């Protein structure tokens, strides 16, 4: 299980309903815990366990940091407008950065920009050089790889500050983050004139990793199974379906198998 602290910034030239000019969102182990936007201009708590474990100075510094970032991405959009010949269009600038704590203790860091839904510039694994996707992004790269102290600063944040605040957050939220919630599973089916398609739905499981597969006489039918993507419910739990088409007379041979941390053994379910 790869633990993660990640921030996602989104800066647009043309806000619209649901899309403020700037949004910054923080995640621990895949789950929201803080949010900032240019609507409020406030780092706000998005999970009880982070609120319960910080003082108002925390929210005040975090708000200060993101107000600065908001101003800087306003400048970055103008900067990128002077780097391409597109006129008055919708511009989207995105940032993702953070750190992974892997199983063995080793660590990785990330700092990647996207412009107009494509890669723009990304910090490499050594964390001292960048990959530019195009000539516009190469102007940023030469500019940045010239500044020894800025390079060190970022490497240190991702290697040291990010990782240790991730550990603090993991402490703060252990009882939420490492809880288990059982999937409530239902197999449905509709026989048509010649083909019965079975549908296995798993409702409300936590944590997010799950394996759902279809079995004929206990033997997996991987090529015949069709999986939706894992998608969230409102209360931080998750949902997945898996279907398989079967011959009606062979109905009785088919069971849906769910592998999940909340289940003592892999669970089997039937129509």
């Amino acid at each position: 299980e790869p633990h993660s602290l990640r921030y996602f910034y989104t800066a647009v030239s043309d806000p619209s309903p649901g899309v403020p000019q700037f949004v910054g969102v923080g995640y621990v182990d895949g789950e929201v815990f803080v949010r900032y936007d240019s609507e409020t201009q406030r780092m706000k708590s998005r999970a009880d366990w982070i609120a319960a474990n910080t003082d108002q100075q925390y929210w005040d510094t975090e708000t200060e940091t993101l107000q600065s970032s908001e101003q800087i991405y306003r400048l970055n959009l103008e900067t990128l407008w002077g780097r391409y010949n597109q006129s008055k269009g919708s511009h989207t600038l995105q940032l993702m950065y953070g750190c992974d704590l892997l199983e063995d203790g080793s660590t990785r860091g990330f700092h990647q920009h996207g412009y107009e839904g494509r890669d723009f510039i990304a910090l490499d694994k050594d964390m001292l050089t960048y990959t530019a996707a195009d000539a516009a992004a190469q102007i940023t790269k030469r500019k940045w790889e010239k500044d020894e102290t800025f390079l060190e600063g970022r490497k240190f944040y991702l290697e040291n500050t990010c990782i240790e605040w991730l550990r603090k957050y993991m402490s703060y939220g252990k009882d939420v983050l490492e809880r288990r919630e059982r999937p409530k599973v239902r197999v449905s089916g509709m026989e048509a004139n010649k083909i019965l398609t079975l549908s296995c739905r798993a409702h409300g499981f936590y944590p997010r990793p799950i394996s759902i597969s279809w079995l004929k006489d206990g033997v997996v039918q991987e090529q015949e199974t069709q999986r939706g993507s894992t998608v969230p419910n409102s209360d931080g739990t998750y949902h997945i379906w898996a279907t398989i088409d079967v011959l009606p007379g062979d109905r009785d041979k088919y069971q849906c198998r769910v592998e999940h941390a909340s289940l003592p053994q892999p669970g089997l379910f039937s129509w």
Partner: protein
Amino acid sequence: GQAKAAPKVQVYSRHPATAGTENILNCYVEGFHPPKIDIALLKNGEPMKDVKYNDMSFGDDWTFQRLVYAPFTPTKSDVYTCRVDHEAFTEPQSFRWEPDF
């Protein structure tokens, strides 16, 4: 140039449905760029009460995700759809909840 991406949509209830038992209807729109989008929950073609909108987020390919949800009580004839309007769509698209009683 501009990398556009059309949404992918899934409609589903929080719990397995039973006719006449309160539930939550979910519509999860993902895979879309630019972020500008309209997502509506519809009961027999008409908007629903108490629709809520989670935080728009994005993943590795830069595309966007948004969860929409509302309370509902499924019945046998009530049709619930999720209507998504996005500029990568030719026209606004509808996705019907399958009761799965």
